[PDB]
């Protein structure tokens, strides 16, 4: 999981 | 004839109309941007998706912010008038208002001004649809445990997050909002309007997914899409 | 028993739930704000309305920016078990992401925040409208001639008007969005989704509104309402 | 006709  | 209603779109023109993917995966070096692990999937599902819906689908990868605003300028000059409907997708890095091209950011403000209903006329009284998986700030959502027409009409913008928040996307699975996004059109297009779609998409994002970081301050974290919606009818992809 | 299905909100509780309405016509002279004329007209067609549809109603005039947050607190930490829903109607002056107190702006996010599934548990799952007549900026429309669930999860926002946009109000009928809001529940609250019957207001407002001003600036304009929606079930007015 |  990463966030943009 | 008989009683007649006008109560959803018209989207039997021959054309469903185009379906734009900006799909920015790499980032120039002095931007400082990571790259986007997992977006192609999202693409590639965007892109099937949509194909079965009978888009016209057109990918475009890793455009500079140049390249986005001639793209959508270019796109709002074509003839649209044998189609329905239009789409746009973007995939990217974002913050409130904005996405990032590969060298900078692009006001959403301005790409959706190209599609006005005075400025694009062969769309007017037609549905514009922007989806967008970026982020909307910093925030993270800890959860909790259970004559004439505005020019500004006919436009839905689906955005993954709630406005001020982070959005989130997994580097093998892709991202949350479109993997629920893709899932529902295929389950329910032929079914349920798109409001109602839409809303399934927030609640499987709300309930099926939930951040894990080795980092606390990203861990266990929730997400909810936001709808903003400017439709002045119901739509279906379906006709007949 | 047999198949059971859920993509609907429960709202065959004891009680539909409370209906606040804050309606602020007259403000402090330091402000420079001018009176509302026409929002005791929308204050009044509001209470019935949501009368008929089994709310709770509260109606408060002429809050101060104190007092708007000591209410929402309060009601915040009102027992809600029994309630299906909530909803919050703000009639004010505004900007985007603000509505004003009789004495100074309020942030929107700092009243919706009360009510956040973390802090309101009472209305956990159940949605959360609050429902906005105010400005979001100073834009006119020209027209054209034709485990866990997140804490955001569960509001919607509809807004009179689209983000950076003036909103109307008329000075003997009451504002163009909340006439049309009322006429539509009225219509269709026992028939339609409330998402179809907030698609019904986009159309009315954008289609049979425009602005009459002896000021070129002003005269002639438009006006589309903004629905942002995180529900994440249907919303039906009735049961069974 | 006015504006909020
Ligand atoms: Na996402
Ligand atoms: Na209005």
Redesign the pocket.
């Given at each position: 999981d990463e966030v943009? | 004839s008989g009683i007649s209603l006008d109560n959803s779109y018209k989207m039997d023109y021959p054309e469903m109309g185009l379906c734009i993917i900006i799909n920015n995966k790499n980032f120039h070096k002095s931007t400082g941007m990571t790259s986007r692990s997992g977006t192609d999937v999202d693409a590639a599902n965007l892109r099937e998706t949509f194909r079965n819906l009978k888009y016209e689908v057109r990918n475009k990868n890793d455009l500079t912010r140049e390249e986005i605003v001639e793209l959508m300028r270019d796109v709002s000059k074509e003839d649209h008038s044998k189609r329905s409907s239009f789409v746009c997708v973007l995939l990217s890095h974002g913050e409130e208002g904005i996405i990032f091209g590969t060298n900078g950011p692009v006001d959403l403000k301005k790409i959706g001004n190209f599609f006005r209903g005075d400025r694009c006329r062969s769309l007017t009284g037609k549905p514009k649809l922007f989806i967008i998986?970026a982020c909307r700030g910093t925030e993270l959502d800890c959860g909790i445990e259970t004559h004439k027409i505005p020019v500004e009409a006919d436009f839905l913008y689906a955005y993954?997050?709630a406005p001020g928040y982070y959005?989130?996307?997994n580097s093998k699975d892709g991202?949350?909002?479109?993997?629920?996004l893709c899932a529902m059109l295929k389950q329910y297009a032929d079914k349920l309007e798109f409001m109602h779609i839409l809303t399934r998409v927030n609640r499987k994002?709300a309930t099926e997914?939930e951040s894990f970081s080795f980092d606390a301050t990203f861990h266990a974290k929730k997400?909810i899409?936001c709808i903003h919606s400017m439709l002045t009818k119901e739509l279906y992809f379906y006709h007949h």
């Open positions: 943009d | 998986q993954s997050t959005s989130w996307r991202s949350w909002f479109i993997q629920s994002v997914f997400q899409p």
